[PDB]
C-alpha cells in the first residue's frame, strides 16, 4: 500500500508537468509502449517529431513519463547542465556494469571522470594507431577469404570481435596473444545483456526489480551478467599478475593506459577505488568501448556501400595519405577530412547511441517559454534530433558536405551530438573516432563494398544501434 500510493502520486506529478506539451495518443495500459515495441519505431518518433515541435511526452506503461526532446535549444537546455541520469532507465545497468562512470552522478562521478580522463589524452592514443591496424588486418584476412566465396555475409559480428580485441590490447593491457574462445563468450553475453535491457526499458511489466528477477527474462539477464563479470574478473587478475613481472612493472612506471590508472600504479590516483568501484568501471568501459564502435563502423561500411561515389572519394583520400607507408600514423588521421565528413553524416542518419535519459535535479526553461520542474524525466532522442527538419534540410538525404568547414561554421553546437555534450559527454570520443578512421580507411583500400538488395538492414535499437538482420554486404578484394 505505502509504495502504491507514492507510485500514483509520481504518475500524476510527471503528467502535470508535461501538460504544456501535446503528444500522441496513449493506450490506457501501455502508454506508448505498443508503438515503441514495433519494428521501425525510431521513424515513427521522427513523424511524431514533425507533428509536435521541440518535444512531446512519452509513456512506457502509464506510470513512467518522459519528455522526448529533439530540438537543439531543448537539448542544450538540459544536456549542458549535468543533471543525473534517469534512474528509471540506468538502474537496469546495475547488475551488469554497476555504478561506473556511465551510471555515476554527482561528485563521485567527477572524481572518477577526473581520474579516467587522462587515459584518453592524445599521447596515450598515438600508440593505439598501430594496434588498430594490426587488429583490422586480422579481420581483413578473414574477409578476403569469405569475399572470394561470392556470397554476402553479415559483417557486424566480425567487426565486434575486432573492436573487442583492439579495445583490450589498447586500454586493458592485453598481450600480443589476441582473441581466445573465452573472449567470444563475453561478446555473446553483451548481445544478451543489451537485448534484454533494451526490452526491459520498453516493457513496463519488467520495471519492478523484485518482479523482474523472478521472470525468465530477468534470470536470463542475470546469467548474462555473471558471464560478463567472469570476463572482466579475468582481465583484472591477468593485469595484476602481469605487473608482478619486474621488466613489465618497471616499464609501465610518461602516460598510463586506462586499466593501469584504475589499478593505481605509481600511487598518483589521489582516489581510492573499492573493488566494486574498480570492476564497475571495467564493466562499464569494456562494454561502451566496443559495442558502440562496432555499430559505427558497421553502419559506416553500409553507407559506403549504399553510396559508391562517396566510397570511392574516401578510398582515394586515404590512398593518397597512405602512400608507400606500411601503415597510417596518428598524424595522418587529421588529413582524412572527407572520410570524417562521411563518418559524421553516417552518424547523423545512423547514430550508434540513438537515445539517452536524464532526471532533472533542477527546473529548466526552454527557448519557447515552456518549462519543466525538478524530478521530471528527459528523453533525448538523438535519432530524431539528427533528422529534425527545422535543422537539416532534406533530413533523410545522405550528404557528407553537410560537415564541410563552410557548411558547419555556424552550426548550432547541440544539433549534431552523437557523442552527447556537456559534462556527461563521451569520454572515449577521440579513441572511437581514431579507431573508426583507421579501420574504415584500411577496409576501403582492401575491399569495395556493395549492399545486398535481398537483405537490406533494418534498424534495431539495442542500447546501441544494431540491425534486426545484421549488415549483410558483398565484398570485392582489390
Ligand atoms: C562511436 C563511438 C561512441 C559513441 C557513439 C558513444 C556515445 C556515447 C553517448 C551518447 C554518451 C552519453 C551517455 C548518456 O547520455 O547516457 C557516452 C558517454 C560515455 N561513453 Fe561513449 N561513445 C562512443 C565511444 C566510446 C568509447 C570508445 C568508450 C570507452 C573507451 C566510451 C565510454 C563511454 C563512457 C564511459 C561514457 C560516460 C562518460 C561520463 O559519464 O563521464 N564511449 N558515449
Ligand atoms: C539507455 C541507453 C544508454 C546507452 C549508453 C551507451 C554508452 C556508450
Swiss-Prot record:
<dbReference type="GO" id="GO:0016712">
    <property type="term" value="F:oxidoreductase activity, acting on paired donors, with incorporation or reduction of molecular oxygen, reduced flavin or flavoprotein as one donor, and incorporation of one atom of oxygen"/>
</dbReference>
<keyword id="KW-0349">Heme</keyword>
<keyword id="KW-0472">Membrane</keyword>
<dbReference type="GO" id="GO:0005506">
    <property type="term" value="F:iron ion binding"/>
</dbReference>
<keyword id="KW-0597">Phosphoprotein</keyword>
<protein>
    <recommendedName>
        <fullName>Cytochrome P450 4B1</fullName>
        <ecNumber>1.14.14.1</ecNumber>
    </recommendedName>
</protein>
<dbReference type="Pfam" id="PF00067">
    <property type="entry name" value="p450"/>
</dbReference>
<feature type="modified residue" description="Phosphoserine">
    <location>
        <position position="409"/>
    </location>
</feature>
<keyword id="KW-0479">Metal-binding</keyword>
<dbReference type="InterPro" id="IPR036396">
    <property type="entry name" value="Cyt_P450_sf"/>
</dbReference>
<dbReference type="InterPro" id="IPR017972">
    <property type="entry name" value="Cyt_P450_CS"/>
</dbReference>
<keyword id="KW-0560">Oxidoreductase</keyword>
<keyword id="KW-0492">Microsome</keyword>
<keyword id="KW-0256">Endoplasmic reticulum</keyword>
<feature type="binding site" description="axial binding residue">
    <location>
        <position position="426"/>
    </location>
    <ligand>
        <name>heme</name>
    </ligand>
</feature>
<comment type="function">
    <text>Cytochromes P450 are a group of heme-thiolate monooxygenases. In liver microsomes, this enzyme is involved in an NADPH-dependent electron transport pathway. It oxidizes a variety of structurally unrelated compounds, including steroids, fatty acids, and xenobiotics.</text>
</comment>
<comment type="similarity">
    <text>Belongs to the cytochrome P450 family.</text>
</comment>
<dbReference type="InterPro" id="IPR002401">
    <property type="entry name" value="Cyt_P450_E_grp-I"/>
</dbReference>
<dbReference type="GO" id="GO:0020037">
    <property type="term" value="F:heme binding"/>
</dbReference>
<dbReference type="InterPro" id="IPR001128">
    <property type="entry name" value="Cyt_P450"/>
</dbReference>
<keyword id="KW-0503">Monooxygenase</keyword>
<dbReference type="GO" id="GO:0005789">
    <property type="term" value="C:endoplasmic reticulum membrane"/>
</dbReference>
<feature type="binding site" description="covalent">
    <location>
        <position position="288"/>
    </location>
    <ligand>
        <name>heme</name>
    </ligand>
</feature>
<dbReference type="InterPro" id="IPR050196">
    <property type="entry name" value="Cytochrome_P450_Monoox"/>
</dbReference>
<keyword id="KW-0408">Iron</keyword>
